[PDB]
Amino acid sequence: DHPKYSDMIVAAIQAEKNRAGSSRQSIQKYIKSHYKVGENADSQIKLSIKRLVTTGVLKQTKGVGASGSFRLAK
DNA sequence: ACCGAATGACATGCATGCATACAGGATGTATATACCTGACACGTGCCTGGAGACTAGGGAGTAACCCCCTTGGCGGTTAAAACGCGGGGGACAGC
Secondary structure, eight states: OOOOHHHHHHHHHHHSOOTTOEEHHHHHHHHHHHSOOOTTHHHHHHHHHHHHHHHTSSEEEESSTTSSEEEOOO
16 A cells, blocks of 8 residues: 655655654654555665655755755755 | 546556576585605613612691680661652664
8 A cells, every 4th residue: 555655755754844854764664654565665765765855855954865864845 | 516628546567676596607625546754653772860768856736725806796877778750862773
């Protein structure tokens, strides 16, 4: 029951509205605990952020690459 | 509000990532084989030093006593141990 990775990621940030930006783990724990994702879930989430930040709609407030915190950037 | 055109959602086609098992094939290792001899094993001296027997005289082992200092006990106070806890920052994991 997993649609395209665009949707839960933005939903997860909406769940915990950190103004400083959500740290990489905060999304990772919730979406796997809440929904059901494939055996290689964590790998897909990391590059999901990586491609998502390249699209520019999300802002990494702290850290470099995937290791930091990210923000919806409205 | 259903009918079309259009479009988002749903369902799957397509391509890919990734894992995995293999089989190869290469290399290193173990086997498998002769010869080889420095080198352990006697072997033969050869003597000196360990044993026998000797005396002598002190140090260890006894008894004997003692007293102190160890152990025991015996309240009183109170300083320190025990407990609760609120939390923050140190460990730690991940990229």
